[PDB]
Coordinates of C-alpha atoms in Angstrom, one line a residue:
Chain A
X1 CA 15.5 0.6 13.7
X2 CA 17.0 -1.0 16.9
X3 CA 19.4 1.7 18.0
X4 CA 20.0 3.4 14.6
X5 CA 20.1 7.1 13.8
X6 CA 19.2 8.7 10.5
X7 CA 19.8 12.4 9.7
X8 CA 19.3 14.1 6.4
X9 CA 18.7 17.7 5.1
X10 CA 15.5 18.2 3.2
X11 CA 13.4 21.1 1.8
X12 CA 9.9 21.5 3.1
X13 CA 8.0 24.2 1.2
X14 CA 11.2 26.1 0.2
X15 CA 13.3 25.9 3.4
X16 CA 16.2 23.6 4.2
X17 CA 15.7 21.7 7.5
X18 CA 17.9 19.2 9.2
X19 CA 15.9 16.1 10.3
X20 CA 17.1 13.6 12.8
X21 CA 15.3 10.4 13.5
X22 CA 16.6 8.0 16.2
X23 CA 14.9 4.7 17.1
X24 CA 15.8 3.5 20.6
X25 CA 14.6 0.9 23.1
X26 CA 10.9 1.5 23.1
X27 CA 11.2 5.2 22.1
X28 CA 11.2 7.1 18.8
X29 CA 12.9 10.5 18.7
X30 CA 12.3 13.2 16.0
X31 CA 14.4 16.4 15.9
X32 CA 14.1 19.2 13.3
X33 CA 16.3 22.3 12.8
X34 CA 15.7 25.3 10.6
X35 CA 19.2 25.5 9.0
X36 CA 18.9 29.2 8.2
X37 CA 17.3 30.4 11.4
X38 CA 18.5 27.6 13.8
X39 CA 15.0 27.2 15.2
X40 CA 14.4 23.7 16.7
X41 CA 11.6 21.3 17.4
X42 CA 11.8 17.8 19.0
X43 CA 9.3 15.0 19.7
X44 CA 9.5 11.8 21.8
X45 CA 7.0 9.0 21.2
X46 CA 6.5 5.7 22.8
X47 CA 5.2 2.4 21.2
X48 CA 1.8 3.0 22.8
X49 CA 1.5 6.6 21.5
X50 CA 2.5 5.6 18.0
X51 CA 0.4 2.5 17.6
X52 CA -2.6 4.2 19.1
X53 CA -2.0 7.0 16.6
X54 CA -2.0 4.7 13.6
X55 CA -5.2 3.0 14.8
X56 CA -6.9 6.4 14.7
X57 CA -6.2 6.5 11.0
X58 CA -7.9 3.1 10.4
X59 CA -4.6 1.9 9.1
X60 CA -2.6 0.4 12.0
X61 CA 1.2 0.0 12.0
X62 CA 3.3 -1.7 14.7
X63 CA 5.9 0.6 16.3
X64 CA 8.9 -0.9 14.6
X65 CA 7.2 -0.8 11.2
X66 CA 6.3 2.8 11.7
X67 CA 9.8 3.7 12.7
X68 CA 11.0 1.8 9.6
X69 CA 8.6 3.7 7.4
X70 CA 9.8 7.0 8.9
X71 CA 13.5 6.1 8.3
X72 CA 12.5 5.2 4.7
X73 CA 10.8 8.6 4.2
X74 CA 13.7 10.5 5.6
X75 CA 16.0 8.5 3.4
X76 CA 13.7 9.1 0.4
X77 CA 14.3 5.4 -0.3
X78 CA 10.7 4.3 -0.8
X79 CA 8.0 5.7 -3.1
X80 CA 5.2 4.9 -0.8
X81 CA 6.2 7.3 2.0
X82 CA 6.9 11.0 2.1
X83 CA 7.2 13.8 4.7
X84 CA 5.7 17.2 5.2
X85 CA 6.0 19.9 7.9
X86 CA 3.1 22.0 9.0
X87 CA 1.9 24.6 11.5
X88 CA -1.3 24.2 13.5
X89 CA -3.0 26.9 11.3
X90 CA -1.9 24.9 8.2
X91 CA -3.1 21.7 9.8
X92 CA -6.6 22.9 10.5
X93 CA -7.2 24.4 7.0
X94 CA -6.5 21.0 5.3
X95 CA -9.0 19.3 7.7
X96 CA -11.3 22.3 8.5
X97 CA -11.8 23.3 4.9
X98 CA -12.4 19.6 4.2
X99 CA -15.7 20.1 6.0
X100 CA -7.1 30.8 19.8
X101 CA -3.4 29.8 20.1
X102 CA -1.3 29.2 23.2
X103 CA 2.5 29.9 23.2
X104 CA 3.5 26.2 23.1
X105 CA 1.0 25.3 20.4
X106 CA 1.6 28.4 18.2
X107 CA 5.3 27.6 17.7
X108 CA 4.7 23.9 17.4
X109 CA 5.4 22.1 14.1
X110 CA 3.6 18.9 12.8
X111 CA 5.8 16.4 11.0
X112 CA 3.3 14.6 8.7
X113 CA 4.3 11.1 7.6
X114 CA 2.4 10.6 4.3
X115 CA 1.6 7.0 3.2
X116 CA 0.4 6.4 -0.3
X117 CA -0.4 2.9 -1.6
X118 CA -2.8 1.7 -4.2
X119 CA -5.9 1.8 -2.1
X120 CA -5.0 3.8 0.9
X121 CA -4.0 7.5 1.3
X122 CA -2.9 8.0 4.9
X123 CA -1.4 11.0 6.7
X124 CA 0.4 10.2 10.0
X125 CA 1.0 13.4 12.1
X126 CA 3.9 13.7 14.5
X127 CA 3.6 16.8 16.8
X128 CA 6.9 18.6 17.5
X129 CA 7.1 21.2 20.3
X130 CA 9.2 24.4 19.6
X131 CA 12.4 23.9 21.6
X132 CA 13.8 27.4 21.1
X133 CA 17.1 28.3 19.5
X134 CA 20.1 26.5 20.9
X135 CA 22.6 28.0 23.3
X136 CA 25.6 29.2 21.3
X137 CA 27.8 28.4 24.4
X138 CA 27.0 24.7 24.3
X139 CA 27.4 24.5 20.6
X140 CA 30.9 26.1 20.9
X141 CA 31.5 24.0 24.0
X142 CA 30.6 21.0 21.8
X143 CA 32.5 22.1 18.7
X144 CA 35.6 22.3 20.9
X145 CA 35.0 18.6 21.7
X146 CA 34.7 17.5 18.0
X147 CA 37.8 19.5 17.0
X148 CA 40.0 17.4 19.4
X149 CA 38.6 14.0 18.5
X150 CA 39.2 14.8 14.8
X151 CA 42.8 15.7 15.5
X152 CA 43.2 12.6 17.7
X153 CA 43.0 10.4 14.5
Chain B
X1 CA 53.8 27.0 10.8
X2 CA 50.1 26.3 11.4
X3 CA 50.7 25.1 15.0
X4 CA 47.7 25.6 17.1
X5 CA 47.2 25.6 20.9
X6 CA 43.8 25.5 22.6
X7 CA 43.5 25.7 26.4
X8 CA 41.0 26.7 29.0
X9 CA 41.9 29.4 31.5
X10 CA 40.4 31.7 34.0
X11 CA 40.6 35.5 33.8
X12 CA 39.3 37.6 36.7
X13 CA 36.5 35.3 37.7
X14 CA 35.4 33.9 34.3
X15 CA 36.2 30.9 32.0
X16 CA 37.8 31.5 28.6
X17 CA 38.6 29.4 25.6
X18 CA 41.9 30.6 24.3
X19 CA 43.1 29.6 20.9
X20 CA 46.4 30.8 19.4
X21 CA 47.5 29.8 15.9
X22 CA 50.8 30.7 14.2
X23 CA 50.5 30.9 10.4
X24 CA 53.5 32.1 8.3
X25 CA 53.7 35.8 8.9
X26 CA 50.5 36.0 11.0
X27 CA 49.6 35.4 14.6
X28 CA 45.9 34.7 15.3
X29 CA 44.5 34.9 18.8
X30 CA 40.8 34.0 19.6
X31 CA 39.1 34.2 22.9
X32 CA 35.6 33.0 23.8
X33 CA 33.7 33.2 27.1
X34 CA 32.8 29.5 27.4
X35 CA 29.6 30.6 29.2
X36 CA 28.3 33.7 27.4
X37 CA 29.8 32.6 24.1
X38 CA 31.2 36.1 23.6
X39 CA 34.0 36.1 21.1
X40 CA 37.1 38.3 20.6
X41 CA 39.7 38.0 17.9
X42 CA 43.1 39.4 16.9
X43 CA 45.3 38.9 13.8
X44 CA 48.8 40.3 14.1
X45 CA 51.6 40.4 11.6
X46 CA 55.4 40.2 12.2
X47 CA 56.0 43.9 11.6
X48 CA 53.2 44.8 14.0
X49 CA 54.5 42.4 16.7
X50 CA 58.1 43.6 16.6
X51 CA 57.0 47.2 16.5
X52 CA 54.9 46.5 19.6
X53 CA 57.5 44.8 21.7
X54 CA 60.1 47.5 21.2
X55 CA 57.5 50.1 22.1
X56 CA 57.0 48.4 25.4
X57 CA 60.8 48.2 26.0
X58 CA 61.8 44.6 25.5
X59 CA 61.6 43.8 21.8
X60 CA 61.2 40.2 20.8
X61 CA 61.3 38.8 17.2
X62 CA 57.9 37.8 15.9
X63 CA 58.5 34.0 15.9
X64 CA 60.1 34.2 19.4
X65 CA 57.1 36.2 20.6
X66 CA 54.4 33.8 19.3
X67 CA 56.5 30.9 20.8
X68 CA 56.3 32.7 24.2
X69 CA 52.5 33.2 23.8
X70 CA 52.2 29.4 23.0
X71 CA 54.2 28.7 26.2
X72 CA 51.9 31.0 28.1
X73 CA 48.8 29.2 26.9
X74 CA 50.4 25.8 27.8
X75 CA 51.2 27.5 31.1
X76 CA 54.5 25.7 30.4
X77 CA 56.9 28.5 31.3
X78 CA 57.6 30.6 34.4
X79 CA 58.8 33.6 32.5
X80 CA 55.4 34.2 30.9
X81 CA 51.8 34.6 32.0
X82 CA 48.6 36.0 30.6
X83 CA 45.9 38.5 31.6
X84 CA 42.8 39.9 30.0
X85 CA 41.3 43.3 30.7
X86 CA 39.3 46.2 29.2
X87 CA 40.2 49.7 28.0
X88 CA 39.1 50.9 31.4
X89 CA 41.2 48.3 33.2
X90 CA 44.1 49.2 30.8
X91 CA 43.8 52.9 31.3
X92 CA 44.4 52.5 35.0
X93 CA 47.5 50.3 34.4
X94 CA 49.2 53.0 32.2
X95 CA 35.3 55.4 25.0
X96 CA 33.1 54.5 22.1
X97 CA 30.8 51.4 22.2
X98 CA 33.4 49.5 20.1
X99 CA 36.2 50.4 22.6
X100 CA 33.9 49.6 25.6
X101 CA 33.6 46.1 24.2
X102 CA 37.1 45.1 23.0
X103 CA 39.6 43.2 25.2
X104 CA 43.3 43.1 25.6
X105 CA 45.2 39.9 26.0
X106 CA 48.3 40.7 28.1
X107 CA 51.5 38.7 27.8
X108 CA 53.2 39.2 31.1
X109 CA 56.9 38.5 30.6
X110 CA 59.3 38.2 33.6
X111 CA 63.0 38.9 33.5
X112 CA 65.7 39.9 36.1
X113 CA 63.9 42.3 38.6
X114 CA 60.9 43.5 36.5
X115 CA 57.8 42.3 34.6
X116 CA 57.0 43.5 31.0
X117 CA 53.4 43.9 30.0
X118 CA 52.6 43.1 26.3
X119 CA 49.1 44.3 25.3
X120 CA 47.4 42.7 22.3
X121 CA 44.2 44.4 21.2
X122 CA 41.4 41.9 20.5
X123 CA 38.2 43.4 18.8
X124 CA 34.7 42.2 19.7
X125 CA 33.1 39.9 17.1
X126 CA 29.7 39.6 18.8
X127 CA 28.0 36.4 19.8
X128 CA 27.8 33.9 16.9
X129 CA 25.0 32.9 14.6
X130 CA 24.0 29.6 16.1
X131 CA 22.7 28.6 12.6
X132 CA 26.3 29.0 11.4
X133 CA 27.5 27.0 14.4
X134 CA 25.2 24.1 13.7
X135 CA 26.1 24.0 10.0
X136 CA 29.7 23.7 11.2
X137 CA 28.7 21.1 13.8
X138 CA 27.1 19.1 11.0
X139 CA 30.3 19.3 9.0
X140 CA 32.5 18.0 11.8
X141 CA 30.1 15.1 12.6
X142 CA 30.5 13.9 8.9
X143 CA 34.2 14.1 9.2
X144 CA 34.1 11.7 12.2
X145 CA 31.7 9.2 10.7
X146 CA 33.8 8.6 7.5
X147 CA 37.0 8.5 9.6
Chain C
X1 CA -19.1 -0.6 -8.1
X2 CA -22.6 0.9 -8.1
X3 CA -24.6 -1.8 -9.9
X4 CA -21.7 -3.4 -11.9
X5 CA -21.0 -7.2 -12.3
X6 CA -17.6 -8.7 -13.0
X7 CA -17.1 -12.3 -14.0
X8 CA -13.9 -14.0 -15.0
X9 CA -12.4 -17.5 -15.0
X10 CA -9.3 -18.0 -12.9
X11 CA -7.2 -20.9 -11.8
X12 CA -6.8 -21.4 -8.0
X13 CA -4.2 -24.2 -7.2
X14 CA -4.6 -25.9 -10.5
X15 CA -8.4 -25.8 -11.1
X16 CA -10.5 -23.5 -13.3
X17 CA -13.2 -21.7 -11.4
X18 CA -15.8 -19.1 -12.6
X19 CA -15.9 -16.1 -10.3
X20 CA -18.7 -13.6 -10.2
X21 CA -18.7 -10.5 -8.2
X22 CA -21.6 -8.1 -8.2
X23 CA -21.8 -4.8 -6.2
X24 CA -25.4 -3.7 -5.5
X25 CA -27.1 -1.2 -3.3
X26 CA -25.5 -1.9 0.1
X27 CA -24.6 -5.5 -0.7
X28 CA -21.7 -7.4 -2.2
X29 CA -22.3 -10.7 -3.8
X30 CA -19.6 -13.3 -4.5
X31 CA -20.4 -16.5 -6.5
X32 CA -17.8 -19.3 -7.4
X33 CA -18.3 -22.3 -9.7
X34 CA -16.0 -25.3 -10.1
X35 CA -16.1 -25.4 -14.0
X36 CA -15.2 -29.1 -14.1
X37 CA -17.4 -30.4 -11.3
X38 CA -20.1 -27.7 -11.4
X39 CA -19.9 -27.3 -7.6
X40 CA -20.9 -23.8 -6.3
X41 CA -20.4 -21.5 -3.4
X42 CA -22.0 -18.1 -2.8
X43 CA -21.6 -15.3 -0.2
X44 CA -23.6 -12.1 0.5
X45 CA -22.0 -9.4 2.6
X46 CA -23.3 -6.0 3.9
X47 CA -21.3 -2.8 4.3
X48 CA -21.3 -3.4 8.1
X49 CA -20.0 -7.0 7.8
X50 CA -17.2 -6.0 5.3
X51 CA -16.1 -2.8 7.1
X52 CA -16.0 -4.6 10.5
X53 CA -14.1 -7.3 8.8
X54 CA -11.3 -5.0 7.5
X55 CA -11.1 -3.3 11.0
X56 CA -10.2 -6.7 12.4
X57 CA -7.2 -6.8 10.2
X58 CA -6.0 -3.4 11.6
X59 CA -6.2 -2.1 8.0
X60 CA -9.7 -0.7 7.5
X61 CA -11.4 -0.2 4.1
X62 CA -14.7 1.4 3.4
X63 CA -17.2 -0.9 1.7
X64 CA -17.0 0.8 -1.8
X65 CA -13.2 0.7 -1.7
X66 CA -13.2 -3.0 -0.7
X67 CA -15.6 -3.9 -3.5
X68 CA -13.4 -1.9 -5.8
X69 CA -10.3 -3.8 -4.6
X70 CA -12.2 -7.1 -5.2
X71 CA -13.3 -6.1 -8.7
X72 CA -9.6 -5.2 -9.4
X73 CA -8.3 -8.5 -8.1
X74 CA -10.8 -10.5 -10.2
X75 CA -9.8 -8.3 -13.2
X76 CA -6.2 -8.9 -12.4
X77 CA -5.8 -5.2 -13.1
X78 CA -3.8 -4.1 -10.1
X79 CA -0.6 -5.6 -8.7
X80 CA -1.5 -4.9 -5.1
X81 CA -4.4 -7.2 -4.8
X82 CA -4.7 -11.0 -5.5
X83 CA -7.2 -13.8 -4.8
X84 CA -7.0 -17.3 -3.3
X85 CA -9.5 -20.0 -2.5
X86 CA -9.1 -22.2 0.6
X87 CA -10.9 -24.8 2.8
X88 CA -11.3 -24.5 6.5
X89 CA -8.6 -27.1 7.0
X90 CA -6.2 -25.1 4.8
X91 CA -7.2 -21.9 6.5
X92 CA -6.4 -23.2 10.0
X93 CA -2.9 -24.6 9.1
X94 CA -1.8 -21.2 7.7
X95 CA -2.8 -19.6 11.0
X96 CA -2.5 -22.6 13.4
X97 CA 1.0 -23.6 12.3
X98 CA 1.7 -19.9 12.6
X99 CA 1.6 -20.5 16.4
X100 CA -14.5 -31.3 14.3
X101 CA -16.3 -30.2 11.1
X102 CA -20.0 -29.7 10.6
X103 CA -21.6 -30.3 7.1
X104 CA -22.0 -26.6 6.3
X105 CA -18.5 -25.7 7.4
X106 CA -16.8 -28.7 5.8
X107 CA -18.0 -27.9 2.3
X108 CA -17.4 -24.1 2.8
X109 CA -14.8 -22.3 0.7
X110 CA -12.9 -19.1 1.8
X111 CA -12.2 -16.5 -0.8
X112 CA -9.1 -14.8 0.4
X113 CA -8.5 -11.2 -0.9
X114 CA -4.8 -10.6 -0.5
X115 CA -3.5 -7.0 -0.2
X116 CA 0.2 -6.3 -0.6
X117 CA 1.6 -2.8 -0.4
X118 CA 5.0 -1.6 0.6
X119 CA 4.5 -1.8 4.4
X120 CA 1.4 -3.9 4.8
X121 CA 0.7 -7.6 4.0
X122 CA -3.1 -8.1 4.6
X123 CA -5.3 -11.2 4.0
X124 CA -9.1 -10.4 3.8
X125 CA -11.2 -13.6 4.1
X126 CA -14.6 -13.9 2.5
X127 CA -16.4 -17.1 3.7
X128 CA -18.5 -18.9 1.0
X129 CA -21.1 -21.6 1.9
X130 CA -21.3 -24.7 -0.3
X131 CA -24.5 -24.2 -2.4
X132 CA -24.7 -27.7 -3.9
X133 CA -24.6 -28.5 -7.6
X134 CA -27.2 -26.7 -9.7
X135 CA -30.4 -28.2 -11.0
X136 CA -29.9 -29.3 -14.6
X137 CA -33.6 -28.5 -15.2
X138 CA -33.3 -24.8 -14.4
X139 CA -30.0 -24.6 -16.4
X140 CA -31.8 -26.1 -19.4
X141 CA -34.9 -24.0 -18.6
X142 CA -32.6 -21.0 -18.7
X143 CA -30.6 -22.1 -21.7
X144 CA -33.9 -22.3 -23.6
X145 CA -34.4 -18.6 -22.7
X146 CA -31.0 -17.4 -23.9
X147 CA -31.3 -19.3 -27.2
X148 CA -34.4 -17.3 -28.1
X149 CA -33.1 -13.9 -27.2
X150 CA -30.0 -14.6 -29.3
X151 CA -32.2 -15.5 -32.3
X152 CA -34.4 -12.4 -31.6
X153 CA -31.4 -10.2 -32.8
Chain D
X1 CA -32.5 -26.5 -44.5
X2 CA -31.5 -25.9 -40.9
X3 CA -35.0 -24.8 -39.9
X4 CA -35.6 -25.4 -36.2
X5 CA -38.8 -25.4 -34.2
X6 CA -38.9 -25.4 -30.4
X7 CA -42.2 -25.6 -28.4
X8 CA -43.5 -26.8 -25.1
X9 CA -46.1 -29.5 -24.9
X10 CA -47.7 -31.9 -22.4
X11 CA -47.5 -35.7 -22.9
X12 CA -49.6 -37.8 -20.5
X13 CA -49.3 -35.6 -17.5
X14 CA -45.8 -34.1 -17.9
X15 CA -44.1 -31.1 -19.6
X16 CA -41.7 -31.6 -22.4
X17 CA -39.3 -29.4 -24.5
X18 CA -39.6 -30.6 -28.0
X19 CA -37.0 -29.4 -30.6
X20 CA -37.1 -30.6 -34.2
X21 CA -34.4 -29.6 -36.7
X22 CA -34.2 -30.4 -40.4
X23 CA -30.7 -30.4 -41.8
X24 CA -30.1 -31.6 -45.3
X25 CA -30.7 -35.3 -45.4
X26 CA -31.2 -35.5 -41.6
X27 CA -34.0 -35.1 -39.2
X28 CA -33.1 -34.4 -35.6
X29 CA -35.7 -34.7 -32.7
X30 CA -34.8 -33.9 -29.1
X31 CA -37.1 -34.2 -26.1
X32 CA -36.4 -33.0 -22.6
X33 CA -38.5 -33.4 -19.5
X34 CA -38.5 -29.7 -18.4
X35 CA -38.7 -30.8 -14.8
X36 CA -36.5 -33.9 -14.4
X37 CA -34.1 -32.7 -17.2
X38 CA -34.3 -36.2 -18.7
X39 CA -33.2 -36.1 -22.4
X40 CA -34.1 -38.2 -25.4
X41 CA -32.7 -37.8 -28.9
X42 CA -33.2 -39.2 -32.4
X43 CA -31.5 -38.6 -35.7
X44 CA -33.2 -40.0 -38.8
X45 CA -32.1 -40.0 -42.5
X46 CA -34.3 -39.7 -45.6
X47 CA -34.0 -43.4 -46.5
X48 CA -35.0 -44.4 -42.9
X49 CA -38.0 -42.0 -42.8
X50 CA -39.4 -43.1 -46.2
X51 CA -38.8 -46.8 -45.3
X52 CA -40.7 -46.2 -42.1
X53 CA -43.7 -44.5 -43.5
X54 CA -44.4 -47.1 -46.1
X55 CA -44.0 -49.9 -43.4
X56 CA -46.9 -48.2 -41.5
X57 CA -49.0 -48.0 -44.7
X58 CA -49.0 -44.3 -45.7
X59 CA -45.6 -43.5 -47.1
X60 CA -44.5 -39.8 -47.1
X61 CA -41.4 -38.4 -48.8
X62 CA -38.8 -37.4 -46.2
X63 CA -39.1 -33.5 -46.7
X64 CA -42.9 -33.8 -46.6
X65 CA -42.7 -35.9 -43.4
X66 CA -40.4 -33.5 -41.5
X67 CA -42.6 -30.6 -42.7
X68 CA -45.7 -32.4 -41.0
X69 CA -43.7 -33.0 -37.9
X70 CA -42.8 -29.2 -37.8
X71 CA -46.6 -28.5 -38.2
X72 CA -47.3 -30.9 -35.4
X73 CA -44.9 -29.1 -33.1
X74 CA -46.4 -25.7 -34.1
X75 CA -49.7 -27.4 -33.4
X76 CA -50.6 -25.6 -36.7
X77 CA -52.4 -28.4 -38.5
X78 CA -55.5 -30.6 -37.9
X79 CA -54.2 -33.5 -39.8
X80 CA -51.3 -34.1 -37.4
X81 CA -50.8 -34.6 -33.7
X82 CA -48.1 -36.0 -31.4
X83 CA -47.8 -38.6 -28.7
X84 CA -45.0 -39.9 -26.5
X85 CA -44.9 -43.4 -25.0
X86 CA -42.7 -46.3 -23.9
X87 CA -41.9 -49.7 -25.3
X88 CA -44.5 -51.0 -22.8
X89 CA -47.1 -48.4 -23.9
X90 CA -46.2 -49.2 -27.5
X91 CA -46.4 -53.0 -27.1
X92 CA -50.1 -52.6 -26.1
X93 CA -50.9 -50.4 -29.1
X94 CA -49.6 -53.0 -31.6
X95 CA -37.1 -55.4 -22.2
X96 CA -33.5 -54.5 -21.4
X97 CA -32.7 -51.4 -19.3
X98 CA -31.9 -49.5 -22.5
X99 CA -35.3 -50.3 -23.9
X100 CA -37.0 -49.7 -20.6
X101 CA -35.7 -46.2 -20.8
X102 CA -36.2 -45.1 -24.5
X103 CA -39.2 -43.2 -25.7
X104 CA -41.2 -43.1 -29.0
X105 CA -42.5 -39.9 -30.4
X106 CA -45.6 -40.7 -32.3
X107 CA -46.8 -38.6 -35.3
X108 CA -50.5 -39.2 -35.5
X109 CA -51.6 -38.4 -39.0
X110 CA -55.4 -38.1 -39.8
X111 CA -56.9 -38.7 -43.3
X112 CA -60.3 -39.8 -44.5
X113 CA -61.8 -42.3 -42.0
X114 CA -58.6 -43.4 -40.2
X115 CA -55.5 -42.3 -38.2
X116 CA -52.0 -43.4 -39.0
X117 CA -49.5 -43.8 -36.2
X118 CA -45.8 -43.0 -37.0
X119 CA -43.4 -44.1 -34.3
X120 CA -40.0 -42.5 -34.1
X121 CA -37.6 -44.3 -31.7
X122 CA -35.7 -41.8 -29.4
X123 CA -32.9 -43.3 -27.3
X124 CA -32.2 -42.2 -23.7
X125 CA -29.2 -39.8 -23.3
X126 CA -29.2 -39.6 -19.5
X127 CA -29.4 -36.4 -17.5
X128 CA -26.8 -33.8 -18.5
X129 CA -23.5 -32.9 -16.9
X130 CA -24.5 -29.6 -15.3
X131 CA -20.8 -28.5 -15.7
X132 CA -21.2 -28.9 -19.4
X133 CA -24.5 -27.0 -19.2
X134 CA -22.9 -24.1 -17.3
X135 CA -19.9 -23.9 -19.7
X136 CA -22.6 -23.5 -22.4
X137 CA -24.5 -21.0 -20.4
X138 CA -21.3 -19.0 -20.1
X139 CA -20.9 -19.1 -23.9
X140 CA -24.4 -17.8 -24.6
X141 CA -24.1 -15.0 -22.1
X142 CA -21.0 -13.7 -23.9
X143 CA -22.8 -13.9 -27.2
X144 CA -25.5 -11.5 -25.8
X145 CA -23.1 -9.0 -24.3
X146 CA -21.2 -8.3 -27.5
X147 CA -24.5 -8.2 -29.4

């Protein structure tokens, strides 16, 4: 963690997404992009949110460890952690079958950090709001910036 | 060859990204509304450009012409200036949905007591697929990291 | 678990001990014997004690899972769990240096169930009261029982 | 050979575990106080046993003698009975700490109009190392599981 940014492409249920995790001073940022449809979700989580979230699972983690787990899962560099991406409808079925949708919730995606060790099987859910498609202006506005820095060197 | 100029310029109350690029035997002119991200694009050959300049009265050779257009975009010459206007705006100076959309980049050349107007037709491309734009943003970001 | 009894010999810090774990209906029993000096400690723990004990560690386990972990550690059949045996003096130093003894506490041993997985490092402590040396009568009384059952078959 | 008898019996207000075992050319007698776990043990050869029985008056051959002692422990004969008493109790019928401790298993043989008293000296072993006893308990428990 400590200022670092990890971004990788990965396929969730037969679709390429761009995933960007960024650990900053007392804030974790997750950003996902549908690379085919350019749809986007983003989440911001504080150390309190995160730690209190893991406590709910009975399997606590401290904020830096969690971010480190997440980094590891994005990097696919650790067999004990894995990701998944779900919709609220999907999310209920895997907990409702175990035993009414607003605009913001309906488009929401849940990034599920999945922790598997010899005696625990834990799912840590990170809720990501639908952020819309981006503005093709600003993308171009921004591409015109990168083009010049590239030519500078 | 391959020389590229990119500059920002205003055309009748709006901001445009103008990119001109001279390949061998091909002039490429792209125009984007920096705000609405509307894009227009022309590709012109030597034969076309020389045929065009004569038609208007003051023929220039293709390299010389591109060169002027490069100066115009650098705003680095008095003899040349640019305008941008529609088939309606052009009609008055002298329509299908395609025509209603396309733009004309005018190279306004000054000599002696008169000004010559060189119209380049630039077709409409549409707005871009922002997916496509992000994939390309991803590529440029990886060029910078390694470098 | 569910009625089962596991007993094995194992060396803690250069001494052979006999360890006996027994999982019964809502009660876990741990019994340790110094095989050279015949000293003995025993502990009985309920599902509430155990579960509330794991919660304290931030890394919950349900009673049957914990007993199963413990069985696994005694059986040395799982790389993620290991045992250790400590005295209260030992126990403090590893937590006091990280930053007055009654009879019953002084002779007490702590069986430390040690859980190591990719992102957690947990020590689960089971306190065992010193039960004295056994009565050589009852041992003999009992050996005279086994001798006859053996000859019966 | 190898025949073993184990029975419980009372001797002057106390409970004892008596084990008698006839190997070839050796009689083994062990006695344990089932309560205090005090243990006494004798090992007697044929020559010793025959020399002993004559001394007392009514010689028996070694196999015959052991056999009687086995009957005595099974309490399965009228002619024989057992007692257990100390060098002090024995003196009266006719001391270093070792002697003060040791016991005598008496085989009381009845014939015609008299009773013959056969004393076997059984040394003190001490109480046992309960460590040792547990190690042995562990061994027997593993014999039973497999079987």
